[PDB]
Amino acid sequence: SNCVKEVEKLQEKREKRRLQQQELREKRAQDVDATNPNYEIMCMIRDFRGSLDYRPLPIDEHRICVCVRKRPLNKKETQMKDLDVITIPSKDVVMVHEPKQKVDLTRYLENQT
Amino acid sequence: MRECISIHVGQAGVQIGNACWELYCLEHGIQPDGQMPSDKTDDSFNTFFSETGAGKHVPRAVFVDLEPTVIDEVRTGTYRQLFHPEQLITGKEDAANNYARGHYTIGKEIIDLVLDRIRKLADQCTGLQGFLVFHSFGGGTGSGFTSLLMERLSVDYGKKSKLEFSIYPAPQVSTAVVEPYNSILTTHTTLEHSDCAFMVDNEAIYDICRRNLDIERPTYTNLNRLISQIVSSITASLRFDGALNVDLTEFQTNLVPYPRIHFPLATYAPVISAEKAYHEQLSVAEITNACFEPANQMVKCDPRHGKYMACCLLYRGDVVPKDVNAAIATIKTKRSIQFVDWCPTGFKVGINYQPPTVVPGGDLAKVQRAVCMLSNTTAIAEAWARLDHKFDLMYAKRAFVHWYVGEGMEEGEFSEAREDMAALEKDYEEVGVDSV
Amino acid sequence: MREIVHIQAGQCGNQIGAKFWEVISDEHGIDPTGSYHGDSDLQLERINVYYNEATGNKYVPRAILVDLEPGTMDSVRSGPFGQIFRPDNFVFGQSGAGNNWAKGHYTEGAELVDSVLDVVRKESESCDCLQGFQLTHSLGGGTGSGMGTLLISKIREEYPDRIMNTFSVMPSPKVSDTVVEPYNATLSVHQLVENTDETYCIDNEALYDICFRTLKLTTPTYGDLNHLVSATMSGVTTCLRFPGQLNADLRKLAVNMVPFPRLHFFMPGFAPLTSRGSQQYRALTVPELTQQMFDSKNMMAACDPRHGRYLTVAAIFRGRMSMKEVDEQMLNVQNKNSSYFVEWIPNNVKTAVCDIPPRGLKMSATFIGNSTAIQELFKRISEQFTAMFRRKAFLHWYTGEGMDEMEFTEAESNMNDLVSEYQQYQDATAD
Ligand SMILES: Nc1nc2c(ncn2[C@@H]2O[C@H](COP(=O)(O)OP(=O)(O)OP(=O)(O)O)[C@@H](O)[C@H]2O)c(=O)[nH]1
Ligand SMILES: Nc1nc2c(ncn2[C@@H]2O[C@H](COP(=O)(O)OP(=O)(O)O)[C@@H](O)[C@H]2O)c(=O)[nH]1
Ligand SMILES: [Mg+2]
């Protein structure tokens, strides 16, 4: 029925909360599609890909009709689970998701547009 | 044991390899026929050498050059008997200072026996640590076939270590104009594989043999002998075992703070003419002072305007731990030596007790105690920017690219390798930032 | 309650373990072959605690020697008492460790731990009533720390009705084999908090102090420190090794010395501070003993108790002396510095006396202390660590061995939390 402990209880309860905020990733970093060495990179792209694309296209005068085509992945790149790193949201924008890595191994995305 | 395996590629790597195993036989005491007086046909040197049947102690090295003129000297020289002949592998047409002929056209057809033979060496061992690769950053053979060879060694031997011994090209003895291209290429492809790359500025070796040995136009011989002595200092902590020396793999760990930052500037202590005689031996303090003068340095750079990330001192000869500690005290604060705010400013010292055996008639004045410092400093990035300039004029006009593309490679591989280089430079920058 | 199964792991852990077995084997009266030759029965009243009883009037250390280096066991066998160890209890690998925790706890170590467990189970089946397990290791290395913490986990999960006891040693910037000692130490502590019931914290830096300053040994070699470790360990285990109501077994001693689940980190104290092979021109008194063994100069952890309040203290006086003088002097030390003791634990300072003194010493004073000052150790590490963990330096040498970046933050956080816990219980009152 004392104090001091109370400030230690406030600790002990939070440490468990932190544990669940780790035991969440693990069994939730499983589930269905949840693998291949690019798993971090894939989860990155997925947390990208959607959740986006509010703005659309007002261009310029060229000397050449320059256009680009994206082909979809085939059986070879899928069996050995390669990743899709190109997206096009509007008939005017080619997006690349250049998977970079800082010096310190922190994976980040260079989003060339 | 805890075995190692040496590999020597290209003119430079093979000749410097011959100087290296020359010195190895001298220090450890073996005659060109491969016989040793003291051994019983499991010791500190049985990692670099294997025992045969008749006590014919034989190296654990594979030599390769695409044009057999440089290896034939091995089979004509004093050590023709020393080697198992099957590991002196040669080609026919030299890569002709062309990286792409190493990495693609010429090397493809020979790599498989190169690795069946390296295999034939690896099955001799009971617990192999890693491979020591000796090559030049310049010539086509040593750049191309080493880039590919490592790309293969990472497949067949993933768990094992891979230490580079690299030869930055000097304009004075440069045998090609396209040396920057080859260098940038083999660094780009070799980076993600190699664990620790000791770099040798040929310009620096030339300046050393200009000052301290007073040779006006030093031959490739002199340079190979000097570089060999330094390499013997580095490997000595692997080839001997006192209670005062630790594995080079023990403090390899402390030299490489980031996967891409694995280039330790080396520094070698007493370098004096055997001709210019009359000489007083230097104390531990004096050679430890010399380990910080850009003269006695290995790569052409300036660590005084750069930060440190580690420091190693491999002493060999007569050295008491207290002498080292005192010299380290005299050096610590008295100089403008700076560490990054994320690193303990500690030194680890490998005291090896065997003296430095120099060469018969080798213009290295023999000495009693020496030190070789491995400092992982950020000023080493200088040596990269000296490349990317000589590069970014030529590649600005795509001059000379047509050869490399004309032997298999695309263009975009150049813009990619170069972009990756600039990335590396900006990483040697990001090391320098602090916090608050 | 009876047998204690002992383990030693790593280069440091195996060295200091060897020296400890030398010490108590000499006290109880055991020779390098294993025969008993003593001249006292009190030596063999409780001899089974640390010794298997073998045929032929022999005595075998119920111990288990673990490493991943080859050569350490070689230094053991050809060592003095290397003949006595039951050779099946040697278990060691060939890879090494490289002062790498992750290597010790997940990879090269995990390919030997089941083979350790089978020898542990072979010694625990020939037991009658097993008390617990005593462990010694380094925290700055790779073998003892990583593979050690692994062993602690699997053994405390295989028999959770027994005691888990560790003698861990610290990273010292004044010794320093590497520069990832903070990482190794940090993770190993993260394990030791939830895993062990008792942890006797030997601080390598503190020992460098006691060698260079009190003993004036200007270039402290490793054996020099291992003498102080050996003496400390011989002293603290006196309660277990000789007839004594106080702290008869591991469970009792732990219940008397541990009032909170996490906080089980003990500052040991030895007196007098003795070099190797040195004369005692004027062996200490009783007041001098009691005065030194609580003084900061005699502490095994590099901490000041003049900064932290003891929660419990187990004092042990070795050598025949006046018991009344002992009780009086202890009362003195307690209520002269009562503003340095917690009062909400009454009679918390227990004291047991032994009669056979340590080797050579006429009288000694061995002190165990559950102090809230021990945080001065953690806060060193938790700073040493943070300085490097901020820009994630040297991480590839562990993540490259297959770990998770969050496993470090769980550790740093758990440690900062243990320190906040210690200060919290330090500011305690009688309201
Ligand atoms: N230190 C040293 N450097 C050398 C030596 N030989 C060549 N180099 C350097 O290597 C660069 C040229 O590459 P080489 O090694 O000669 O060519 P290679 O490896 O035989 O490849 P190919 O010539 O195509 O057969 C020059 O810039 C030299 O500075 C040597 O014996 N010692
Ligand atoms: N007291 C003592 N400490 C040591 C000794 N050897 C190493 N250490 C310390 O323990 C750490 C090295 O651990 P070590 O056992 O050598 O590595 P491991 O073989 O992977 O367990 C360093 O922080 C050293 O300061 C020793 O002989 N005695
Ligand atoms: Mg050639």
Ligand SMILES: [Mg+2]
């Ligand atoms: Mg070890």
